[PDB]
Symmetry: C3
């Protein structure tokens, strides 16, 4: 568990990214290597897999001596990171001691000490699934569609066809449809091998998109009765990926 | 019975309906060739609301034949709150018994709202012998009601020739909001005799909750008489409340 | 008659009163020809607060009859919270037993706040042998206190000739906020000798809650001595807290 020093310019942006992962998980193992920081975890119900990848290219200083895995209480990490200001420099540092030193450098130098925990790691792979539909859309559209559907139902049907992407929710008497074509502003890309239909739990979807930005380009990949893969990019280079089991 | 009604600016429409739903739970909307109208009373029958949305405020207005639809106002307002400020709002009725509510913006979002039937009533909005008229900024009215609520549950309106006063008093605390024509908040005052009435603050608060700070609000009242309060929507629409006085 | 006091910017006045009401419930305001002063303690007798508002910060200052009035700070603050940023505030004491609080803006809004009897102690604001002086941005002070509260119930203040540190430590967790003159948050540092004291975070949080992020706050303390925290109102007014150290 060697020392390292990792520096990110923009503490609040980093906190927001961590906050998005923390919405679903409580504890996480962070793999720190020379190439970057990665984290893979499942939510407690084992319905969502989260994969975070932060290559060294997004850090203004990146000094890792030997690869190591550190365990982190995500609630306590997020609570500290939330104190970072938008212009703060964030420094994540480890010495010989078994804690993480979290420093915000801005109008003052503020250093927190976060105890490291033991996180027993599951065997988790991010499989390459045969998705038959790909959608790139503005986060604003995706976030509102999930909110719109929650007025109506507990589940949201995703329907991809050659020229239109539809999210549809139906209640006992009440119903909502959110429809995008490439003529629409909210839709950046649509690729459909065959017409694809799946449905997903809104409570999970709401937790996945809560932290996503309204201007972020979110990529969706899914298949008929297959999981939904949802990702967006951090500084174009890092990537947060969710894999969500379909509602059966 | 098809119709199609289009309003540019969904959030503004939501705000307008939100004002009415503060006192109303269910409403019949009369949809004719000339515009949309709605008239309803709060559950205690203390406040009458009248909403008139002429054809001229809609960007597209296509009514086949006049008809009346009943709407649960809380459900309507919940859907309409999903509209964004730059959305186009489309209100469409096919041959079925549901109102199709579409927001067209970055995406096309269509809600289906089931229609209900509403006990329609002997509701007219008569013209009473009001003796005072006050036009004032919504900011002044809203703040005066909030101010008086610190003090009491009733607000006394007092109009004289050159002054309009709203006064409230508790057992020791008191507040007076005074307006003369030299005040930026008072846009017009017409007083044909000294006029004095009092109204319940809980009703007033619900009436002004949705009014904008820069909306121009017209008050008409008489002594121990109802209060008529109205403001205009896109200049041509009109929202009118008639409020029973308090003893 | 006995006095009329006018302050331009009612909301700014409310914010200043609101800071003091965070620690105190009741206060005696002494109105003299020179200005308004107030001195009080929190219920636990841990914090002394001193407010001095010279006549120079008021647009009109007329004290015919000097006197001292007793005010419930919660009621005072509730009324002052109704003032708008552009309102003129008028404090008027008539012959009677109430304070007249008027907001003059788009309208004239007058509240009557009944005066109360406050058992006044003789509170001295002592000269103390402070060995460290720190001038820092309110933003840094307020954040440090918030940071420390994630960790502990008390915050250590450590001043050395070139650095000011606030440190909190829990069972296992720890935070350190460090300032040097190189840092934007530190405006002045004067250290007669190494100085270390600790203070309850719950008190500090209440002291700084109303202070602005842009405000310039002066701290003075000594080893195992009280903390004196002051900031200026319109350059000439001054709000001072004196906080007992913690053991």
């Amino acid at each position: 568990h060697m020392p390292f020093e990792i520096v990110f310019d923009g503490a609040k942006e980093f906190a927001d990214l961590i906050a998005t992962a923390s919405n679903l998980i409580d504890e996480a193992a962070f793999k720190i290597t020379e190439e970057g920081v990665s984290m893979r975890a499942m939510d407690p119900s084992r319905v969502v897999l989260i994969d975070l990848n932060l290559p060294e290219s997004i850090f203004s200083k990146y000094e890792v001596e030997e690869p190591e895995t550190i365990g982190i209480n995500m609630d306590h990490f997020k609570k500290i990171l939330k104190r970072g200001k938008s212009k703060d420099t964030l420094i994540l540092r480890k010495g010989d001691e078994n804690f993480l030193e979290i420093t915000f450098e801005g109008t003052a130098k503020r250093t927190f000490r976060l105890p490291l925990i033991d996180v027993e790691e599951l065997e988790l792979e991010l499989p390459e699934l045969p998705f038959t539909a790909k959608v790139v859309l503005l986060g604003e559209v995706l976030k509102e569609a999930i909110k719109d559907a929650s007025l109506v139902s507990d589940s949201l049907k995703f329907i991809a066809k050659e020229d239109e992407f539809t999210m549809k929710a139906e209640g006992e008497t009440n119903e909502v449809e959110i429809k995008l074509t490439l003529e629409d502003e909210g839709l950046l890309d649509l690729e459909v091998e065959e017409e694809t239909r799946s449905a997903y739990g809104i409570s999970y979807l709401a937790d996945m998109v809560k932290g996503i930005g309204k201007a972020d380009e979110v990529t969706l990949r899914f298949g008929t009765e297959m999981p939904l893969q949802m990702d967006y990019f951090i500084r174009d280079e890092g990537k947060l990926t969710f894999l969500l089991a379909p509602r059966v």
